[PDB]
């Protein structure tokens with residue numbers, strides 16, 4: 001016996017929610033959700049499948065739904081329920097400032113050390129929680145973290161997430177479109193994936209944030225990456241980064257998976273640094289930087305149903 005998964009999957013009527021506008025094209029809407037028979041309005045993102053004629057695509061979105069229903073943490077994405085219309089709709093908490101990669105590209109000039117290190121802690125907390133839940137994300141990247149507020153981010157995209165069995169050390173994949181430049185060496189060579197492969201990608205995610213959304217190994221093709229890593233080459237020290245911050249990124253990219261840090265240790269190291277941010281990141285102008293009815297609106301984070 002593993003522990004039973006008593007996550008609740010909530011089925012919503014299409015009449016419970018109003019699509020307000022498009023955010024993306026699968027097509028994502030900003031909208032509002034009124035839970036049946038409750039006087040509350042919840043800002044949501046409603047992901048509606050396009051063709052909805054593809055049995056493959058329907059297995060995909062429901063796998064996402066399975067994983068997102070089974071996680072409850074402040075630093076991971078919050079599913080509110082699904083709607084089984086012609087086109088299946090996922091309803092999640094609206095994350096109004098979009099993905100963190102776009103956010104740090106758009107706002108390079110306004111982002112101070114305190115925000116960057118707090119983001120590093122929050123993502124470390126999200127990933128430590130997933131580890132507690134024996135869940136390997138397999139696609140952590142700056143693009144797959146969302147911004148509820150500039151003070152508050154959550155890990156997203158559980159489309160590749162795999163739920164390690166009671167006796168299963170690694171997860172074993174076979175083909176697809178894969179993020180080579182974020183992947184542990186053991187993942188590119190032997191399709192091996194663990195919490196420790198997730199630490200490698202946390203390292204690349206941190207490097208994306210510390211370079212204000214630069215592309216890892218830009219101009220180096222996917223075919224070369226495994227060879228570069230075997231030859232011991234790693235991503236360069238970002239300009240803002242003290243050796244303290246960069247040495248943490250470097251340890252996440254050790255070839256011995258068990259030599260990399262644990263998510264619980266990254267939480268600790270980034271917290272120590274977050275208490276004195278200007279000791280650990282050096283940024284030009286750091287001290288200066290600052291980042292009908294709405295009556296019954298509540299954020300999804302204050303909308304709890306019984307457990």
Ligand SMILES: */C=C/C(=O)Nc1ccccn1
Nearest residue numbers: 045077078092093094095
């Ligand atoms: C997991 C939350 C979510 O996907 N919400 C979202 C998506 C895109 C933009 C804004 N919020």
